[PDB]
Design a protein around this ligand. Structure first.
Ligand code: NA
Lengths: 105, 105
């Protein structure tokens, strides 16, 4: 997986993989972008006691890390409203969200 | 490869692969979406004696097939303005362009 579409996400332990980059929703509740073995970006949500966190691209454009209850602990703060969005891990190392769809076959 | 970013393209012979689907910039200058061995969408640009064609997603949102001397033979007609866009060959066999970017990093 290198992309997320509307209301898709990463469960604890799941990742987006494009070598040498991995975007991992970790067990410690931190969302971390690794470049080879080095962390280059994090959501800074790594909190003892917080397990079962998930990162979800919402259908309003917002990318959110939720804790096990439903508390939003980090967001991209990209609410644009109704649309079709995708989040992509690119091979230039950036994770980016595009929307809304402008063409299709 | 399943995506093209800005001023990335498929040159002659190149393709996006998400099994069982292929988006191929063929040597006959036709840009064709295959579902297994069946063409389900084409640019219809195998013209008589055209070769070395390329399909490039541009920074204005337009997706264009060019001949070897840079004449535009087909376009998506999806110009939305200067920004950042991606074309995705999706798991459901749809090819779609999203953009412009709303978040990154
Ligand atoms: Na998807």
């Amino acid at each position: 997986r290198n992309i997320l579409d509307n209301n898709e996400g990463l469960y604890a332990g799941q990742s987006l993989d494009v070598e040498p980059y991995h975007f991992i929703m970790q067990d410690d509740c931190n969302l971390v972008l690794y470049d080879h073995s080095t962390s280059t970006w994090a959501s800074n949500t790594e909190i003892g006691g917080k397990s079962g966190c998930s990162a979800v691209l919402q259908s309003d454009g917002n990318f959110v890390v939720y804790d096990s209850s439903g508390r939003s602990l980090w967001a991209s703060h990209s609410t644009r409203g109704s649309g079709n969005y995708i989040l992509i891990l690119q091979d230039d190392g950036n994770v980016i969200i595009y929307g809304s769809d402008i063409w299709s076959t």
